[PDB]
Design a protein around this ligand. Structure first.
Ligand SMILES: [Ca+2]
Length: 223
């Protein structure tokens, strides 16, 4: 997150860190056994780290659980990033408490103008590099289809929305990838892509979770 603030420890209990030796992506816990993240975050040997604030200090609320099964969406295209969504099942169920909590799947897509919480351990600089040890947060609006398709012509599908600030200055960034875009208690988006970070007229593009509820459901049911 560029241009946000420090969330405060455990104030976003559904936020996961994906660790494969180090933090490499965010995710969202959606029930005791499952995490949703972006497909472009796919790796082998993923450890899901729950209840995290400082990803470099053991603070006493963490649960570390290895991935049982990874499932990249059946239609993930990596050149266009269409269908950038992915499920991970946990070797064992997370103990749900107020430091480790799941987020609801949407029942309907948010409209442009809806305000959402985006969070992660991604780069915090628009120029240059700085990765925080603590979870960072940002409140950002959803942008109309029109203005999104104007920022990235020929690049936005009906499985993507833009969210953020066209004047730039505030955005998600690398390392936030795969993490939550939560609007009014529902997971609407997944940090997916964008040209640079917090650049003018290049807002953040997110996977539109409301299209995948069916698939998620479903996949959970038979696995
Ligand atoms: Ca920690």
């Amino acid at each position: 997150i560029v241009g946000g603030y420090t969330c405060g420890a455990n104030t976003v209990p559904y936020q996961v860190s994906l660790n494969s030796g180090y933090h490499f992506c965010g995710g969202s816990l959606i029930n005791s056994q499952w995490v949703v993240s972006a497909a472009h975050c796919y790796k082998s040997g993923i450890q899901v780290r729950l209840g995290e604030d400082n990803i470099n200090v053991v603070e006493g609320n963490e649960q570390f659980i290895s991935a049982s099964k990874s499932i990249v969406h059946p239609s993930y295209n990596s050149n266009t990033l269409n269908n950038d969504i992915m499920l991970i099942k946990l070797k064992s169920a997370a103990s749900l408490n107020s430091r480790v909590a799941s987020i609801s799947l949407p029942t309907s897509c948010a409209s442009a103008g809806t305000q959402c919480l985006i969070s992660g351990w991604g780069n915090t600089k628009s120029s240059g590099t700085s990765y925080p040890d603590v979870l960072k947060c940002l409140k950002a609006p959803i942008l109309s289809d029109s203005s999104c398709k104007s920022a990235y012509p020929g690049q936005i599908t009906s499985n993507m929305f833009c969210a953020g600030y066209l004047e730039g200055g505030k955005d998600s960034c690398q390392g936030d990838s795969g993490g939550p875009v939560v609007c009014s208690g529902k997971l609407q988006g997944i940090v997916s892509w964008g040209s640079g970070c917090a650049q003018k007229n290049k807002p953040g593009v997110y996977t539109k979770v409301c299209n995948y509820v069916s698939w998620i459901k479903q996949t959970i049911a038979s696995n």
